[model samples]
Target: GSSGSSGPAKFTEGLRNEEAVEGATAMLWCELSKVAPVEWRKGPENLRDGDRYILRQEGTRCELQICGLAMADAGEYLCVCGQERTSATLTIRALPSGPSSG
Candidate 1:
C-alpha cells in the first residue's frame, strides 16, 4: 500500500474523502512518480454541472483536475490510473444562508 516502506499506499492528492462548504470550490487531482502507464478516463457526465475535467501530462508527472464545485457537486469523484483508480468523496455542509437547511 506504500512505497515499500512499510506504510499505506501513496496517494497523488488529498484524502480519499473529504468535506466542503456549500458554494465553495474544490479540486480532485492525482499523479504518480513512475515509468509506467494506464487508461486515461474523463469525468462521468451525470455530475452535469461539471465545469472542466482536465487531463495534463508533462514529461515529469500527469494529473487530472476536476473543478467547478458547488452544493450539487457533492459526491464521489474518480481519479483513475488505467485499471487502477482512486476515489474521493466530498460531503458538503450548508452555509448559514445556504439553501440546504431548515
Candidate 2:
C-alpha cells in the first residue's frame, strides 16, 4: 500500500508467474496501470545494472526476464512506475519439488 497525492495506482493485473522445472528459464510478467517509465528492482538491488535481469517495455506493460532460474532467485520483486513513483511487488517461489509438485 502507498499514500500520498498519488497513492498506489491500481495494477491492471497481478504478476504473471512462470513455473519451470529445475535448470529451466523463468520469466515474470507485470502490467502497470498507467503509461510511465517502469523500473524493476530485486530486493534492494536494481536489476537494470546487469544482464542477470532483462527489462522489456511494451506500452504500459512490462516484463522482467530472468534466465537460468535458481533457488536463490526466488524472492519479492518490485516494479516501480517511474513517473508516479509507485510500485507493485511479486513473490517468486522456488519449489523444492519443482513446478509440477508445487
Candidate 3:
C-alpha cells in the first residue's frame, strides 16, 4: 500500500538564521514532513527544557525558545530527528556602546 523509499523525515521548513537584541528572547523553529520527536542542541552541548531554554513540539512543528539572550548565547543551533538534522545560527545584537565627548 506504500511506495517509494522509506527514509528519515525531511524538514519542510529548514531552520533559518535569527537575530535578537541582547536581553531579548530568540525563537527558532522548523517544520517536518512527519510528526516526530526532535532534539535541540547548541553546538556540541545538548539542550534541554529548562529555565533558560524551552523546547516544544506541536504536530509537525518543532520550536526552541531562548530567553534573556546574551552575547554568549549567540552561536549555532541544531535540531536532530532520527537521522535527519538541521542547523541555524543565532546573532545577538549588543546595545550601543560609546562615551559622549564633553
Question: Model 2: which residue pairs collide?
Answer: none
Write one digit per residue (lDDT tens) for candidate 3, span 10-37: 7889799989888888999999887777
Candidate 1 residue lDDT tens string, 9-64: 23344235677776565544455544234233335633322246455556224444
Best by TM-score: 3
In candidate 2, residue 30 scores what lDDT? Answer: 63
The better candidate by lDDT, 2 or 3, is 3
TM-score (C-alpha) between model 1 and the true structure: 0.49
Sequence-dependent TM-score of model 2: 0.59
**Whole-model Cα lDDT of every candidate shown, in order:** 0.51, 0.58, 0.84
Q: How do these models rank on lDDT, best leading? A: 3, 2, 1
Tens digit of per-residue lDDT, candidate 2, span 22-57:
445566666666555566676776776248666677
Candidate 1 yields a Cα-based lDDT of: 0.51
How far is 50's C-alpha from truth in model 2 (Å)? Answer: 4.2
TM-score of each: 0.49, 0.59, 0.81
Angstrom error at residue 4, model 3: 18
